[model samples]
Target: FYVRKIRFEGNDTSKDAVLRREMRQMEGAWLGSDLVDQGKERLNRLGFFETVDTDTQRVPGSPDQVDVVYKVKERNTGSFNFGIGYGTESGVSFQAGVQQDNWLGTGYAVGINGTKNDYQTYAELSVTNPYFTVDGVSLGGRLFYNDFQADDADSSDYTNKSYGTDVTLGFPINEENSLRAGLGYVHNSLSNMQPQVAMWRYLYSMGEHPSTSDQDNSFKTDDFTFNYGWTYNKLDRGYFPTDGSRVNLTGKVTIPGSDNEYYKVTLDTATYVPIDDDHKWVVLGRTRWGYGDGLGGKEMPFYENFYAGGSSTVRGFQSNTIGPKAIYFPHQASAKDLCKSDDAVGGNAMAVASLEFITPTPFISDKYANSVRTSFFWDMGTVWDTNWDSSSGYPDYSDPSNIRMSAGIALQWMSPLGPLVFSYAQPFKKYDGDKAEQFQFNIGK
Candidate 1:
């Protein structure tokens, strides 16, 4: 029998088109039981519904026709959050944000986020249309401003102020894969110049006075860049996923005529395996690898260096302190009296990996199972300057021997006000000059 019509019920806030776009079965087509079931599954995966039930009935007085219907109950898709928290790296911080995933019955997202802390101020506005075209071409854009004081955040002596905007388009390649491309413009001003010791040595080696106006360790750049990526996502649920995996490969390159000539590439991946029928027990593994370098004989800008440590990367190490140390020269003489500074200057390459045993919070009601999670985790990572060479006036900072490892326990809660994370970690291995922190936590939107 042909499908006389396809329709949805109980979707008061979402437009008919929004739900219709997810249906794999079409009206007036021969009704296939498999397509109808597939459509139901697609709607359930949209994350906008608490439940989706499907049924079919014969068209009145028409023996060769039938109607398919989906009944859905909507879930909350908007949130306003504000909170204050402290972390070993960012220190005490306050954050607030408003986000709406389904705005005014449209499948669009709008969000604004802002943060203020001991060492940084940041704000961003973003908007996205997940289905700008019938074939699932998506569009998104954002504008952001950030002011950071490195000396206050991680004992690095410098400040950076930046503002930028980017526009991107996403093309769906199938049910589980997509491609994205974007263009961006950014302006950065570096000031409050207490140059890192490495910067001083590089300047001296070039026959330029360390304090010369051109080499005074402060500058501004206006840059343009192209970005692209491919993503594979198959998580069972968007919030606290318990099964499936995700992988992302992304890259960025400064335009040839822009103020800088450089490129960065990163690969990130995660997998979750459920061990119980109820999904209360799971195992998760994640890894990230990043590399950046200069092009056309130019040096990669120091400000673009990568760092690994703290809660998000390697839990026991202090944030941004897991990389190469600056070399301090005590004498004006040639290279004989130099020692490594305590300050970490970051590096151009990074690798981080994590493993976790996840469990539902004990004593919590089943109704709250989706909102709270606890885990025991282990983290390992390293950052190294890939370009370090003998002539750079410092010991090689690109040794993989500096990898750091830690074990910890963590809790995560999707509270009414925001999301929260608490972790306590122990570092079993370390090298000279590496700083470690035992406890760290944060709450934010």
Candidate 2:
């Protein structure tokens, strides 16, 4: 069958653009029952549409072309959420937020997030228009304030207030490719803090004890980021992110404002490849270089720099713990381990490479599935600092060298609420400080 035309109705509150984008089926396209079913599944995942139904009307004289119509029931676009988690450095932290996906039916989104940890508390408010003033353009802004205290005896506590805005415009070159450009600005104020710790100290010390005492320091920065990429989707379903390969290339330059200006650039790319009908794997790589110039050749703020480690990237280590050789730490625990410590110690910066594998379960039936996807996975990654110059310098956080590897099975659960993922990782390159395999849990929107 063929779809000659597509129409949407009964959407008074939702904009046409939002509805059209949410509905994947298009006019004059060949219709496949499997694809249509998958499209329905995607609409359900959006959370805005509560009820989705479609109908096809045959053309007057043609048997091949038919008009398809999607009727959807929209839900209240506003929501409030709160959660708490325990990790190494952050200790027991709590987060609360409110979000509005469709504000006044204009397709604008606004959100406020607040998080509190043992050493600090942060609050941020952000607004964005995915379709800016025109279709295919986007704009966003954020205002954040943070109160942080150093765990070391030599370092002093500090509070910072920052505001930033970003504007991005994206143009679809074709169905498979798009280009985007963005500009951003940030201004920060610091009080009762050490200059070194407030800058890039974390990368060097690997979250070790404070080396400098309170010296009161602060700076502002402006960042310009640009990215262009092609997304290929031969997959049957979009919500699952399965059976498709995606590649992204991104670059950014951060120019500090005033005498504190620092220049930094980065290149990053990630690719997801399917191994078979049931297994998928992903590889990610990134590199960054920074120069202290412009503003009297001053170093950039530590918060603005990049670091490796963490669940979404290099799995076995803490977040933002990778950096240059002089700042490298051979042995450090995951965030999960650091939070339990009375003193925050060990963090660093360096380059890293990571590989991840995901395999789906055939024994589970879609209709009877509770909400979790049964899968098996393995991850491997490495970090290095200035002292360790080569692959040999890659200290194994789990053991011998810096190379860290883990293998485990995972349970991916999906509910009307969100997704819950639990994984257990085993370290192959074990070190004295490394802990054995254990479970890691994450829940997200």
Candidate 3:
């Protein structure tokens, strides 16, 4: 069959420009079931509609021609909210934001966010156009800045500012994999770094510092990056997946002539399995790994380091507080008093894994999956740099003894505001100085 025309119904708010962009079938294309179904999936994934369907009708006098009719039910695509939540590492934070998932029904997204907490303050502005061209090239970026000083009670300890722009293009490789390439430019400035802890170990190890010709704490750098990655996704749902698996492996490198010469590899994968017929009970496992190293004989910046812990990782530990320790003060008190601040310095490599068993609530066993969910989880992870030098500080690279593990039980409510999770954890195992957190939760759209 061949398409004679295309029409839409119950799409009062969605622009034809948006609908046509996601459709995989063209008016002159052969009417194959696969092509038509692909178009349906694309429109449904746009998040602008709760349901998308289509029907075909034969042309009045043409036996081989049919008009395709797409019927859609729109979902609320705009959100404005204020949020408050607690975290083991950051304590409590207050946030306000406005977001629109489908701007002008063009499949574009725009959002502004601001948050404040004891450890830091953050603000950001972002916008994304999923289909900048007829072929699905995407363009979007975010501008963000963060200030941190209260971690160890010092106002001038490690503040970072970054501003940049980026462009991305995605190419499909069958239904199981897609390749992505990105180009971006960033200007970064970091100031007031304390070296007492292992956090700055690499700098000290490589003889870099502010005492003289070493790296400057208040210096600025303009850098460029070229990135390539492969992604695999197969899931029934993204927000609350109950079946299937997804994976990503990425390799990122600074351009040969960029200001920052670095090479990195990151891997993330998650698998979900249903244990019952109605899919009420599910098992999910996730793990992440990464390694970042300097290229052209340069040392990777501390900001590029890997860190583990917090809500998504080992739930019983504080955020990014599970890595090597550092010292910022001198070994002794001079005639003038001075002492180093102790902190988790982070690392160049990381490993983490988590397993969760989710079951539906008693009365809601037949209700929507988002209505309620209870889960028992086990989380464990570690982060360390192989550049460890016993002479300078604690050297714990890939050491099994430094691993941290935790177990917890959690409950969730899909309230009007958003999906919320509450958890109580037990630190089944931990390292000597690792910070353990027993309770945590967060809620937001």
Candidate 4:
């Protein structure tokens, strides 16, 4: 096709300003099939519309002259959801949220959500404007109040709680990469510490050292961080991706005067490989590594630790139960466990990796097809604290040179809301202090 003028129509809610901000195809540009497809993909991916299509009209007088018209079918951008689930970390959890994805004919969104579980409780409000400017700059903010209660807390006796706000601005680097940065401030308070293993057989606790609801350190500091990150993504879809790879890196540095000065860095990467042309069988490998340390002769706060295990990181283990252990104090003399497994105190460093073979189910009809898939995976990861005492629990897990490992099979469904995952994994190489669970499942986890 030759060069042509482009236009948009059939948008009932989204405005021209919003549509143009997301357009990858343009007027006075040479028309290519690849370019057209990319434009359609971009529009559909915006999430404002259910259907996006493009049509060509030849000019009557000139065979070379044509008009490219883009059409979109608006979707119901408002949603209300409520869910409850169980996890090795929080035990029983419940969440509710209401969202408006496309507000006032502009590509802006607002939502409110609340969550409660055995481990923590939180309430939050969020807003996002993808078309904050004409050049594809996105502005968004999140305000939240949280209460963290852990019985096996590293310190003495207290719960971690906080209220904070985060503002982020996203800059599109290209069709596949984007740069993002944000500023945040949080006021944290600790509740009186307490723990009771009566919750679960191997319940993890958020504990403290006999402290009141106080903001002694970073919890009460200002200027949480000067954060920056860059991401490159070529995935075909965010949910249930069939092709492409994504790489993201983020860095956060806390100012000296803000609190105890510290800096954190994390890297996340995922690659998907398709074995068959029909997209039936595929291979996926994902890995994450992170580190956090204090700056200028300061001590990294214990609250700002990294956790490993659970469904998201490594299966076949309890949530956040694969890391260093705190000094366990059993209020009930009836407490019993197989190993020296106490409550898990997170570590300042974390490492994790996973490999999976994704395939289709035989019993289901082809209609289910890619919508429903199964996978066999091998997962390995560990977290460790530098402050751990060799005289205490497990010395082998101190530096975590011995990484915990697991292998299992999983079932996944692209249900109405999001992906539902259920897995059965076998505990592999692990330390005596590690908490292990053979079966795990969570909907909308």
lDDT: which candidate is best?
Answer: 1
TM-score of 1: 0.71
Q: Give the distance in Å from residue 43's predicted Cα in candidate 2 to where it truly belongs.
A: 27
Q: Which regions in candidate 3 have their CA more than 4 angstroms from the true location?
A: 1-86, 91-135, 141-156, 172-178, 197-208, 212-217, 331-342, 362-370, 391-401
Q: What are the per-residue Cα lDDT tens digits for candidate 2 across 289-349?
A: 2222122333344444344444544444444333221211121224221111111122223
Q: Using Cα atoms with residue i matched to residue i, what is each candidate's TM-score against the true structure?
A: 0.71, 0.54, 0.69, 0.70
**Candidate 4 residue lDDT tens string, 1-445:** 5757667787776787777767666667777777776778889878877888878778778867777778777788589989776655566788988989766556678899999887678999988887666777888789998887665322223477888888888899898999999887777664343342111111122222232222232223334767889998999888787789999899788855575567888989999998999777989989988888756555455566788887889999877778776443343224443233466767778999999888878788767676778899999998976544456334544576878899999988877866677889998877756778888877764
Q: Which stretches of candidate 1 lie over 4 Å from their true place?
A: 1-84, 97-113, 125-131, 139-141, 200-217, 329-339, 359-372, 391-395, 414-418
Q: Which is the better candidate, 1 or 4, if ranked by TM-score? A: 1
Q: Give the TM-score of candidate 4.
A: 0.70
- 77, model 2: CA deviation in Å? 5.8
Error of 3 at 87 (Å): 3.5
User: lDDT per prediction?
Assistant: 0.80, 0.50, 0.72, 0.72
Q: Where in model 2 is the C-alpha error above 4 Å?
A: 1-134, 146-161, 170-178, 190-239, 248-250, 255-257, 264-272, 275-296, 318-350, 360-371, 374-376, 383-402, 415-418, 430-437
- For model 1, which pairs clash? none
**Model 1: how large is the Cα RMSD against the reference?**
11.0
Which tens-of-lDDT digit does each residue in 1-445 have in candidate 1?
Answer: 9898888888777789888899878778899999989898999888888989889988888989999989898887588988687666787788898999867666678899999998899999988887576887978888999998776767456678999998888899889999999999888887755544555543343334345232236667788999899999999998788999999999899997677778988999999999999999999999988999877556666777888888888888888778787664443212355556667778879998999999888888778778889999999888887767665555568687778899989989887657788888998876667898888887763
Model 3 TM-score (2 dp): 0.69
Native-referenced Cα lDDT, model 3: 0.72
Of models 1 and 2, which has the larger TM-score? 1
lDDT of 4: 0.72
* Best first by TM-score, ranked: 1, 4, 3, 2
